Amino acid sequence: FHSFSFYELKNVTNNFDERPISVGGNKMGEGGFGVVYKGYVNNTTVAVKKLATTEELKQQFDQEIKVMAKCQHENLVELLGFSSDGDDLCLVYVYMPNGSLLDRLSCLDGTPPLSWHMRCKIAQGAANGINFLHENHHIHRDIKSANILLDEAFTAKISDFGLARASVMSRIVGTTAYMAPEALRGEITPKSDIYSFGVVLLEIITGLPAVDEHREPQLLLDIKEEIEDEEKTIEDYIDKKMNDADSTSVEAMYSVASQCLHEKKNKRPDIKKVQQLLQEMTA
Ligand SMILES: NC(=O)[C@@H]1[C@H](Nc2nc(Nc3cccc(C(=O)N4CCCC4)c3)nc3ccsc23)[C@H]2C=C[C@@H]1C2
């Protein structure tokens, strides 16, 4: 990695301006380590995470580094460096031009809807990123659409490794709308990551967020039960902001989603099967 001065990062982010990009400032959004800022260093656009308890935050800071030191891959975000010298710890990444899957699915800041063809490639890439992490004996613990970033060619890039673990069952963490039953109870298994990817795939098919309090069902994973009981079909939930979806491949992706969302962890497919199933979709 390169090493950055805190005051260099403070300088190139307009003294950490927290108002959004469109109004004038540098806040791109908010994640696991709070606010992420846009900046420019070494003739290169960069995302800066400012890691603002303080003791528990440093453990997550080192985890992001220890994971991103060894684990370099096509479908994982890239850490360019870090800063420890100033008041708070910081992490610098290569800026992903198209932001998060979540924001593009909701068309935040007026971006055009993602096509079905685009959505499939993203599904595949995300699975490939998750596959690399499981091959290298890592569990993410926070797979969700906010943590899948999209590059200049809409390549899926998995991010946020603060809550990741290397390789069990008293500190339960993650985002409850995406977490499996056993993870909510406190189990640390790579099978929990497959469940969450199940929900992420339902977001891709439907363009609906995992949770919405102004909606029935409030949790997106409950549509699986609506479809199995034949009250509604998957075709009734397909995102209407696409002009290029077809039934077969959508049903194919929903089948992968449905198998991922099995409540019994040992009956879910492993990531290599999910990856194989999603390749058979496009082929
Ligand atoms: N899991 C996350 O940390 C998410 C995201 N983090 C990042 N975002 C971006 N890119 C980004 C973000 C927002 C806007 C735009 C943008 O310019 N456009 C123009 C066309 C449409 C979008 C680009 N790059 C990186 C690189 C390393 S982390 C990261 C942020 C949003 C939600 C959180 C914080």
Domains and CATH numbers, the chain: 2-94 (3.30.200.20), 101-282 (1.10.510.10)
Residues 197, 174: Cα–Cα separation, whole Å: 13
Residues 87, 51: Cα–Cα separation, whole Å: 10
Q: Are 88 and 232 in contact (CB under 8 A)?
A: no
Q: Are 210 and 199 in contact (CB under 8 A)?
A: yes
Q: Which residues pair with 165 in a beta bridge?
A: 139
Nearest CA to ligand 1 atom 8: 99
SS (H, E, C) 83-150: ECCCCCEEEEEECCCCCEHHHHHCCHHHCCCCCHHHHHHHHHHHHHHHHHHHHCCEECCCCCHHHEEE
Resolution of the experimentally solved model in angstroms: 2.5
Please tell me what DSSP assigns to residue 32.
T
Cα–Cα nearest to 254, from 278, 232, 218, 229: 278
Residues 260, 195: Cα–Cα separation, whole Å: 5
C-alpha dihedral sign at 76, 73, 163, 45 = negative
Q: Are 99 and 149 in contact (CB under 8 A)?
A: yes
Residues 273, 127: Cα–Cα separation, whole Å: 10
After which residues are there C–N gaps above 2.5 Å in the chain? 52, 167, 169
Q: Tokens for 167, please give them.
A: 């390789």
Give the determination technique.
X-ray
- For 48, counting Cβ atoms within 10 Å of its Cβ (0-12 exposed, 13-18 middle, 19+ buried), the class is buried
- For 207, counting Cβ atoms within 10 Å of its Cβ (0-12 exposed, 13-18 middle, 19+ buried), the class is buried
What is the distance in A from the centroid of ligand 1 to the CA of 226? 33
Cα–Cα nearest to 93, from 76, 105, 108: 76
Nearest CA to ligand 1 atom 3: 31
Cα–Cα nearest to 88, from 49, 36, 38: 49
Q: Which of 21, 36, 76 to mutate to test the pocket of ligand 1 (most atoms within 8 A of CB)?
A: 36
- Known binding residues for ATP are 28-36, 49, 144-147, 160
Nearest atom of ligand 1 to the alpha carbon of 96: 24
Residues with CB under 6 A from ligand 1: 28-31, 36, 47, 77, 93, 95-100, 109, 111, 146-147, 149, 159-160
Residues 132, 31: Cα–Cα separation, whole Å: 23
Q: Which of 64, 100, 175 to mutate to test the pocket of ligand 1 (most atoms within 8 A of CB)?
A: 100
Q: Annotated catalytic sites, by residue?
A: 142
